[PDB]
Design an enzyme around this catalytic site. Structure first.
Site, PDB file in Angstrom:
ATOM      1  N   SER A 145      24.033  33.955  20.958  1.00  0.00           N
ATOM      2  CA  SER A 145      24.812  32.738  20.662  1.00  0.00           C
ATOM      3  C   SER A 145      26.292  33.119  20.512  1.00  0.00           C
ATOM      4  O   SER A 145      26.848  33.756  21.407  1.00  0.00           O
ATOM      5  CB  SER A 145      24.195  31.948  19.484  1.00  0.00           C
ATOM      6  OG  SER A 145      22.808  31.714  19.746  1.00  0.00           O
ATOM      7  N   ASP A 253      20.810  25.201  28.052  1.00  0.00           N
ATOM      8  CA  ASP A 253      20.934  25.675  26.662  1.00  0.00           C
ATOM      9  C   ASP A 253      21.258  24.503  25.726  1.00  0.00           C
ATOM     10  O   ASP A 253      22.162  23.696  25.985  1.00  0.00           O
ATOM     11  CB  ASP A 253      22.017  26.755  26.634  1.00  0.00           C
ATOM     12  CG  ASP A 253      22.151  27.425  25.294  1.00  0.00           C
ATOM     13  OD1 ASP A 253      21.486  28.424  25.040  1.00  0.00           O
ATOM     14  OD2 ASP A 253      22.989  26.923  24.495  1.00  0.00           O
ATOM     15  N   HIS A 302      17.294  27.783  22.971  1.00  0.00           N
ATOM     16  CA  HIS A 302      18.501  28.440  22.438  1.00  0.00           C
ATOM     17  C   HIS A 302      18.185  29.796  21.808  1.00  0.00           C
ATOM     18  O   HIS A 302      17.421  29.825  20.839  1.00  0.00           O
ATOM     19  CB  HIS A 302      19.137  27.503  21.384  1.00  0.00           C
ATOM     20  CG  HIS A 302      20.432  27.998  20.785  1.00  0.00           C
ATOM     21  ND1 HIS A 302      21.590  28.181  21.515  1.00  0.00           N
ATOM     22  CD2 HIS A 302      20.753  28.289  19.496  1.00  0.00           C
ATOM     23  CE1 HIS A 302      22.561  28.592  20.702  1.00  0.00           C
ATOM     24  NE2 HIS A 302      22.074  28.669  19.476  1.00  0.00           N
TER      25      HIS A 302
END
Ligand SMILES: O=C(NCCc1ccncc1)NC1CCCCC1
Ligand SMILES: *[C@@H]1O[C@H](CO)[C@@H](O)[C@H](O)[C@H]1NC(C)=O
EC number: 3.1.1.98
Length: 358
Positions: A145, A253, A302
């Site tokens: 991330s 995503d 994610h």
């Protein structure tokens, strides 16, 4: 279990001036080192940093960190859970700088918060060299991330640091998970007046100034003063990097959809949104076409790499731990051991191995 070490150089700090740190499990028979950058958004002005300090404080301070953590996914030491690097030396670096790992500014009379992400990485590497990293053959800088974007911003700086310190035999590589975003046309649009309305390009431009953010030099020289935000977008920074980098990126995503003002809800997808989502997947596949080491499944999700069930997803019949093993062999094409794995089907969960979410 990975054990906490607070930095000995206590001038390298989290947002509130508490010392930064790292968690370490070391593997005395191994010359491989995995350093993982945690993610979790960012803040870019006094008001939104103050709110983050009340309800996300572990992402801004070390005061309440636990003494140990359990490694999961690629940080697990059990081969059952981590077929790829279970016997490596393992390092988890907590994200407590709120700056996508880019900052180089201290708390001071003029600064309520410190933004030291780029310096935290440098200091962790320095202190590890006295704890066995001096004997390494491979240092893999990984992250998820905001930490995956952090890999792209920092991997060549770690390579330069090790060269200048006199360790030219350590091979520095990057693994960027869920950090490859598009500065694309959004599905609905608002001018940047507060946190919720500010598109990523505008929020990152403001953040760089608030953080004293730094980007890789070869990318900075292309885009020049004032335009450093471009280097936070993977498809623009990646061609400027010299260290080998493996890119893991869901095609749909959930963070990309969120910043595009798309919210999957109650199942009623009409033609305009259908075309928007299909075009997003095609654009993200296009950006990966000339990235030789990549894993990009057609799923709405994610992060991947620190999840315990990370081995379940496959592209064309190959799992991520297998593709990373094939990447290792490539850096010593290979029969039956591929390294470029991008789905071509056009809609989330058209790959049956996508995470369910349960
Ligand atoms: O904005 C992001 N990630 C999503 C952050 C986020 C998380 C939860 N709610 C709202 C927003 N990263 C940026 C994208 C542009 C490239 C540099 C990293
Ligand atoms: C501690 O870190 C700061 C910032 O990176 C650096 O300028 C300073 O030299 C370091 N202290 C020591 C004793 O190395």
């Amino acid at each position: 279990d990975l054990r906490l070490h607070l930095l000995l150089n206590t001038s390298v700090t989290c947002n509130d001036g508490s010392p930064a740190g790292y968690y370490l499990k070391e593997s005395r028979g191994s010359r491989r080192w995995l350093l993982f950058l945690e993610g979790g958004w960012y803040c870019f002005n006094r008001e939104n940093c103050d709110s983050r300090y009340d309800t996300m404080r572990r992402l801004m301070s070390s005061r309440d960190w636990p003494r140990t953590r359990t490694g999961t996914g690629i940080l697990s030491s059990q081969p059952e859970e981590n077929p790829y690097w279970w016997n490596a030396n393992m390092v988890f670096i907590p994200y407590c700088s709120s700056d996508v790992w880019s900052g180089a500014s201290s708390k001071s009379e003029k600064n309520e918060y410190a933004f030291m992400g780029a310096l935290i990485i440098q200091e962790v590497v320095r202190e590890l060299l006295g704890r066995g990293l001096s004997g390494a053959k491979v240092l893999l800088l990984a992250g998820s991330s905001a930490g995956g974007t952090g890999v792209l911003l920092n991997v060549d700086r770690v390579a330069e640091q090790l060269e200048k310190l006199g360790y030219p035999a350590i091979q520095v590589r990057g693994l960027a998970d869920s950090g490859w975003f598009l500065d694309n046309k959004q599905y609905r649009h608002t001018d940047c007046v507060d946190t919720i309305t500010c598109a990523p390009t505008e929020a990152i431009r403001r953040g760089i100034r608030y953080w004293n953010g730094v980007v890789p030099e070869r990318c900075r020289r292309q885009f020049q003063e004032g335009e450093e935000w471009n280097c936070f977008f993977g498809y623009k920074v990646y061609p400027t990097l010299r260290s080998p980098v493996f890119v893991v990126q869901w095609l749909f995503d959930e963070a990309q959809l969120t910043v595009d003002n798309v919210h999957l809800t109650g199942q009623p997808v009409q033609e305009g949104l259908r075309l928007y989502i299909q075009n997003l997947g095609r654009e993200l596949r296009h950006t990966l076409k000339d990235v030789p080491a990549s894993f990009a499944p057609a799923c709405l999700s994610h992060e991947i790499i620190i999840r315990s069930h990370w081995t379940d997803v496959q592209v064309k019949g190959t799992s991520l731990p297998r593709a990373l093993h094939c990447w290792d062999r490539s850096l010593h094409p290979l029969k039956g051991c591929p390294v470029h794995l991008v789905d071509s089907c056009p809609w989330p969960h058209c790959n049956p191995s996508c995470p369910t979410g349960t």
